[PDB]
Design a protein around this ligand. Sequence first.
Ligand SMILES: [Zn+2]
Lengths: 62, 140, 344
Amino acid sequence: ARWNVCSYCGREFEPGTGKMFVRNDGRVLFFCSSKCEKYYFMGRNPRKLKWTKAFQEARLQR
Amino acid sequence: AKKGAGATRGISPVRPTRALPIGAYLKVADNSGAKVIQIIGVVGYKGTRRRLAAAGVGDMVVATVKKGRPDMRHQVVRAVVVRQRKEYRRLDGMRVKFEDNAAAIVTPEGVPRGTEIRGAIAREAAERWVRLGSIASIVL
Amino acid sequence: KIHRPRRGSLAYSPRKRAKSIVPRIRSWPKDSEVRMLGFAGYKAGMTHILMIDDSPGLTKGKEIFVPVTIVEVPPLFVYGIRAYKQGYLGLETATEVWFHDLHKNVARRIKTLPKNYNEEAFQAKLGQLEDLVNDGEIADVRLLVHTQPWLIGLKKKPEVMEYAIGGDDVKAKFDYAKEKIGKELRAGEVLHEGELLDVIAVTKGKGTQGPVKRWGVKVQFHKAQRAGKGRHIGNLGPWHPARVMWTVPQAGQMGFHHRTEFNKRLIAIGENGKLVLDGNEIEITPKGGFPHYGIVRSDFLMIEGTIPGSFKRIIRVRPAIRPPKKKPPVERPQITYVSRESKQ
RNA sequence: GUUACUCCAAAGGGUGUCCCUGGCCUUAGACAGCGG
RNA sequence: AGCCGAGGGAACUCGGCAAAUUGGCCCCGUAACUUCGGGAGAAGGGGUGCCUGCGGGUGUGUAACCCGCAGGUCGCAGUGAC
RNA sequence: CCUUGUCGGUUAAAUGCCGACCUGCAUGAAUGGCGUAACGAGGUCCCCACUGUCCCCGGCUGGGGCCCGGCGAAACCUCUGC
RNA sequence: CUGGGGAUAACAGAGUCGUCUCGGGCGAGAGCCCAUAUCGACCCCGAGGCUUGCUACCUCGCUGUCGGCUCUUCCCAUCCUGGCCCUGCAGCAGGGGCCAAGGGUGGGGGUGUUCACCCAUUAAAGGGGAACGUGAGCUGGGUUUAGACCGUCGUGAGACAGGUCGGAUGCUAUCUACCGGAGGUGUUGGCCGCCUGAGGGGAAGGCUCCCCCAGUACGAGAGGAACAGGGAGCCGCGGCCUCUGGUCUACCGGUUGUCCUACAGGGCAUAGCCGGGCAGCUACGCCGCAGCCGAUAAGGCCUGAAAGCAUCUAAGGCCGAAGCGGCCCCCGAAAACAGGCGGCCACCGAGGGCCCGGGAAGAAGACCCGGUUGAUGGGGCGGGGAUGUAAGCGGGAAGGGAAACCGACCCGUUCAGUCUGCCGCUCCCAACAGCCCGAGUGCUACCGGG
Ligand SMILES: [Zn+2]
């Protein structure tokens, strides 16, 4: 019973949900929902969206 | 036991979803002369009226060689699936998926051809065929 | 020629709306433990857990994913004892005894309740029943039960039912019954944790449907789709016999059928809406409640998997009548996680 | 089988049972068992 | 009569019927064969919004219509619909 | 005609299509013969791309169908109708 | 073209069965020798009506058709799946025969094809009937019109059971039949509730692979089994939406073109187009689907005579199948012996319907919960969720201009604003006022009390 962490919006999501994406080079990604995954593969920037944590990580770099 | 010290098979607990039907083109991930293959059948499958056979990860398929080196084309081979783009559930409930559809060419009795799988492969394939994990430098 | 199996089952025919909304139990199992052979409740919702597998087969000893249905079960009130004798063909009722002080809301179902009927007469009638049961003309004893929805706030009009008792004898059954009449039954006094159950209920309504969805008929070719006959079947039959047979797929009522389901494991019985894991006390109701059902207050059951019916519907469980030979143990499995997150 | 005819099966076979006929045997015959 | 459909991609059918793909403009680059006129928009590829500005052609023109370039920035998408 | 002629190529698999052969049942030179660029809502075989054609179907929209008020026919019809 | 024909063909039916499919008797001979493991000639005797013919009994405007798709059902002369017997059966297998019709018998290539041929798999990829099942069910490739081309035949008009291109697909269901839904009468008084279950339906389950048994028995070696036990999947069936995907013309955002003067907020362009999406529906997701008791078939045995011995049978016993019956699921008091129990009314009034507020149910009807002994709908207050940080104000911004000032976009105020076909509390508004159906009569022939 591990709580995993989304690679798009950075939050902890519960056992029995989500997705793992594997690249052919062995690197792995975790997704909490369909939205985060679609935005990732579409190319959106989570660092401009105030509902992620990349936003605060950038608020620092300002 | 009878003969278990050196074998080719095993048991997986997952049974992934069947997502690649007849007529599908898979990439070849192993270092054999083959580059692309087309599925013409699925081993150990019985169906009904108007249904096509379909395979997933860990399944062996009868295939044709479309592109590849001259001594391999228009030949019928057998191949194990190692990756698929459609998801499939693991026991803890999390779901898994890959980037493309790949296969390794093998012998009708499990022994593989080739000597190195370029890329990652799924764990269920390696649990079911014990000689693949001995080739690939990434198992997930 | 080409062969395939037929489309649909002829074992659930006629496929017609159920005679009643309260289900019906036709047969009862062979139990030796003298106890009531069932309970009833109202369905609340679904969720999921993670548990260590106790059941035989590989995957045993691992952490897996198990979906779960929560069934809300307030206590029952026992108000009746009913005797049966043997007639020319089968059983037939012989005598009934009711309790005197019954709730004001039972007359919402049984309008015509008795008028004088004090404890004097109640005890006299009980005595008559006992002097009859000690004779020999008696074949089995059953209990009469009603639900109490006023406790959870769901409704007032109750449900009334008749349940059986375990054992080969009738005087042990009568002792049990005479001890239980006039009082309340809770689910922990009857059901064990880990039992296999058969669930019995009435399914959801879908309405009038066509044969494609109701029997599995194959949609027709795209030329027929452009002709006006895609979701139709082709043939009502041959020339001889010169009538339509009852085996030919047609349209009609889909849903609201009386169904049964075998071998659903009871995992947990809780008290007052909380589940006391080994470690700490916890709630089951999720954040924001259950959709289309509010909060859980009284008592509840965890059932492995799915069951027939919509949420607020009345369910009836019994101990398994058709169990396998390799049973899982009777004890609450090790639960590692229960989901309280929003289900809407 | 319970079919006048309209509308209904054979060649080949049977220590199934009931009967006719003609040879050979018989006061020790035709099987058994005990031995030559 | 219409809109969307995961994973596969004609395995459907007499037959890829029906639907879908492409799609405007500028620049680059374009075969066989040929009645030397064509083929040819062959094929194949890149670009394309808003804002702040700089220049050119005709013209008396801080009138009017046209032609080239740099920088900044927003979005999954700039012939954004038609 | 015998005929799915035979050899080769194209497919995992070819009563097909294309290229060669010639015992042309019953080709043939203005009832024209052999070719042929460009053209064809002409017949025909392959490749790439594209797709709900198919595996295998699901969901949504508008108009009908269904209920209510109003106006108001016809084709058919020996009698009947397990 | 007309007038007519089943007095007369092609097409399906009836009749018949030479032909056809499926069989049998006898024993020549072949099988190292050995008539019967297997094959069985020459000759003789048959079943069926699934090929084809013969005839011309029905039908000449009923319908004229081949193949394919869809859908249901039957036979056994059994391809696999269960059980057995003989072998020229060591094992693995093969060959030949008996019972058995519960289940299964698929996907593709060229061809209009049926069949036939080929590929890769499979436990195996059986053959037939139902008006050559099935056009008031579709299609329309072939075939039999009207157009045109080639080859042959013909002086010619023209023909070819020779090839090729192209070539119309109508219906408002009168009666019955079937699927589902309602309203009556009856059940010898009316109404509540709860039960029995006569009968009917069922495949609700069928099959395969792996480990072990065991590199064991068997076998010179090569090779190579079985009973018991553990597990997994495919086809089929019945359900659910916690998880994952799809849709979501509720909702949130971004943007093009034009119009409302510009901002702001809006209309139209398929919801204008794009992106995300809760409830709900759905599968590409997930849960569930006993082998046991009884009686039998082929077969294997006991006792046992006819026929002092023998003999599975004549009389009598014991065993023995995926097949029959029951246990299990679905429907079911109109089951005409038209049921049983408890209670309430009748001999004014028990109960019910309309009506009101809603859905967990729905084509109309029916069904379920509530109706001030009240949280049924709305509102207000809060919880949870979906999008994704509102307008206005303040500051910055590539660069321009004498300067005032322009200026796409960025930061802050701001997990914001908008929305909620989801939950909870709270009588602030409305579930009021009412109106109708309704059993109620008796006699002889009686049963048991009076
Ligand atoms: Zn996320």
